Write a protein that binds this ligand. Structure first.
Ligand SMILES: Oc1nnc(-c2ccccc2)o1
Ligand SMILES: [Zn+2]
Length: 140
């Protein structure tokens, strides 16, 4: 689990978005596994505006941050895990790393701020849903 809090936005994995996320829906993309909902409290996270391919992600299944090299956001086919079926996903970045189902929502960050959140796992790979192209997160 985990979210990004920037301005009056909460960013979550679409598949973990709560009833309260959906009630206050701003934006969702089923092809990206992202959902943004409205918050009343002004958030403190900064979104990275960069093309870094290096950063640090939080892995709850190891209670550790790992430094990783990651691919540029792409359209990538995601294979079936234990709890979720397979499918395609856009704006997806892969790294060599540990990722289990409950790891979704762990933040990937570089010196410029938040890059993405954990979205996919399995086969010694971690997938991050990129948020750096959502410029609108940095006002109103
Ligand atoms: O599956 C699901 N998650 N949230 C909702 C919801 C939220 C508000 C009103 C109706 C439904 O539905
Ligand atoms: Zn960066």
């Amino acid at each position: 689990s985990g979210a990004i809090y920037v301005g009056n936005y909460r960013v979550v994995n679409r598949h973990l978005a709560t009833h309260n996320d959906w009630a206050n829906l701003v934006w969702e993309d089923s092809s990206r596994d992202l959902l943004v909902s409205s918050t009343t409290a002004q958030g403190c996270d900064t979104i990275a505006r960069c093309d870094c391919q290096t950063g640090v992600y939080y892995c709850s299944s190891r209670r550790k941050h790992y430094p990783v090299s990651f691919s540029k956001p792409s359209l990538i086919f995601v294979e079936a895990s234990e709890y979720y079926p397979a499918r395609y996903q856009s704006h997806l970045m892969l790294a060599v790393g540990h990722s289990e189902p409950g790891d979704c929502g762990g933040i990937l960050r570089c010196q410029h701020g938040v890059v993405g959140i954990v979205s996919t796992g399995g086969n010694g790979l971690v997938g991050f849903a990129d948020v750096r192209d959502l410029l609108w997160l940095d006002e109103e």
